[PDB]
């Protein structure tokens, strides 16, 4: 019956302290965790396992900025600098051995968000449908949206000036490094295509607004 | 040196079982527990089991008995799990970890296996060449109507890997598409051939496409 609670998500301004926390059930106040973090599409990483006085012995590649604390029940993650980079799921853990059977259990993690960070500006490259996709009376446009941050868009497309709901597929965006990329993709026919004089891409994000636009003519 | 190495993504049928295979190297098999994690909807993490690859000793989660069964080959130094009977909430990135004998932390940890259960039909990608529009130039590829994931997408087979963005993929009615982007000098295309080389193993289709003017 042992359980890690954790905070759904946690909000800490850029440089500023950040303290986690992991409440042990009230049965187990004595136990020692791990932490771990977890990046979106990356295994997740052992930061510390963190003992009932407050010993920490963080792991290998984790910073001076990352250190442990123990309060009776709750065990604590304390980031120093509240960097862009610690943005992640933080993750604890426990190991119990009753007779010889092993288990180990986690919190539902904490998701933290760096606030007061400099945005990025999306910037978009479109393709018009290739010739061959054309000779099959069908027209992809491709808008690929890269080196935004944080990873908030909304994306749109019009047609001449009217707004095209259909046929729009808009991924969910990917961290590349410290900013983000996104594509969408407008399915047209090779008609329709061929109709109109215009063609656009639109994304929104964070109050701005990124256009590009095709001519089906050039 | 330290690496545990995970077998490639899984398309399973709803009904059938898939065997995943974590290798162990640059350290001793036989004095570490192997476990096992899954990565849950949303956010967080599931445990499992453990193998103690010594003695063949195995615990799980309640919730896993009937459906995970981990094995060790000493031989091979290669823990597996086998998951039974799989439905869409089986698909999900599996994690084997590694832990002391002593019930501690999960130090070292795979790259992930992304097992897909689903009965929707394996479809080759239709791979278009994205010239530019009307010193330097963006040339694209478009990865149109796939399934199951993975694609691997390269440029000139990898040889061409500064300026490469390959875009999230996006999923619409059990079909995967993709675009993928490079930028290059005019000094370089179009006087070299330039092709963007899609695999997709679940078909076993290879596909390079030339970007011509």
């Known amino acids: 019956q042992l359980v890690l609670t954790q905070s759904s998500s946690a909000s800490f301004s850029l440089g500023a302290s950040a303290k986690l926390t992991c409440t042990l059930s009230?049965?187990?106040?004595?136990?020692?965790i791990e932490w771990y973090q977890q990046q979106p599409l990356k295994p997740p990483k052992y930061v510390m396992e963190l003992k009932k006085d407050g010993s920490h012995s963080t792991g290998d590649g984790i910073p001076d900025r990352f250190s442990g604390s123990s309060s009776g029940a709750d065990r604590y993650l304390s980031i120093s600098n509240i960097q862009p980079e610690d943005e992640a799921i933080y993750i604890c853990?426990?190991?119990?051995?009753?007779?010889?059977?092993?288990?180990?259990?986690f919190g539902g993690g904490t998701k933290v968000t760096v606030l007061g960070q400099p945005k990025s500006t999306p910037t978009l490259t479109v393709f018009p449908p290739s010739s061959e996709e054309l000779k099959e009376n069908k027209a992809t446009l491709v808008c690929l949206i890269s080196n935004f941050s944080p990873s908030g868009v909304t994306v749109a497309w019009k047609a001449n000036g009217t707004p095209i709901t259909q046929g729009v597929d808009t991924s969910n965006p990917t961290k590349e490094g410290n900013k983000f990329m996104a594509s969408s993709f407008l399915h047209l026919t090779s008609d329709q295509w061929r109709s109109h004089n215009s063609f656009t891409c639109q994304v929104t994000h964070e109050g701005d607004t990124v256009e590009k636009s095709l001519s089906p003519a050039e | 040196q330290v690496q545990l190495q995970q077998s490639g993504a899984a398309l399973v049928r709803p009904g059938t079982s898939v065997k995943v295979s974590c290798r162990a190297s640059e350290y001793a098999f036989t004095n570490y527990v192997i476990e096992w994690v899954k990565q849950r909807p949303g956010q967080g993490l599931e445990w499992i089991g453990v193998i103690n690859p010594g003695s063949g000793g195995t615990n799980y989660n309640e919730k896993f008995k009937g459906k995970a069964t981990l094995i060790a080959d000493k031989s091979s130094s290669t823990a597996y799990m086998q998951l039974s009977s799989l439905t869409s909430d089986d698909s999900a990135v599996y994690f084997c970890?590694?832990?002391?004998?002593?019930?501690?932390?999960?130090?070292?940890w795979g790259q992930g296996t992304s097992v897909t259960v689903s009965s929707a039909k394996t479809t080759a990608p239709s791979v278009y060449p994205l010239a530019p529009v009307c010193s330097s130039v963006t040339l694209g590829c478009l990865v149109k109507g796939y399934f199951p994931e993975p694609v691997t997408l390269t440029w000139n087979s990898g040889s061409l890997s500064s300026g490469v963005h390959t875009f999230p993929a996006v999923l619409q009615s059990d079909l995967y598409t993709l675009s993928s982007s490079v930028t290059v000098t005019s000094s370089t295309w179009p006087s070299q051939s330039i092709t963007c080389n899609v695999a997709h193993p679940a078909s076993s289709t290879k596909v390079d496409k030339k970007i011509e003017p």
């Open positions: 853990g426990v190991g119990d051995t009753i007779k010889e059977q092993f288990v180990y259990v």
């Open positions: 009230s049965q187990h106040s004595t136990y020692t």
């Open positions: 970890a590694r832990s002391t004998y002593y019930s501690g932390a999960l130090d070292y």
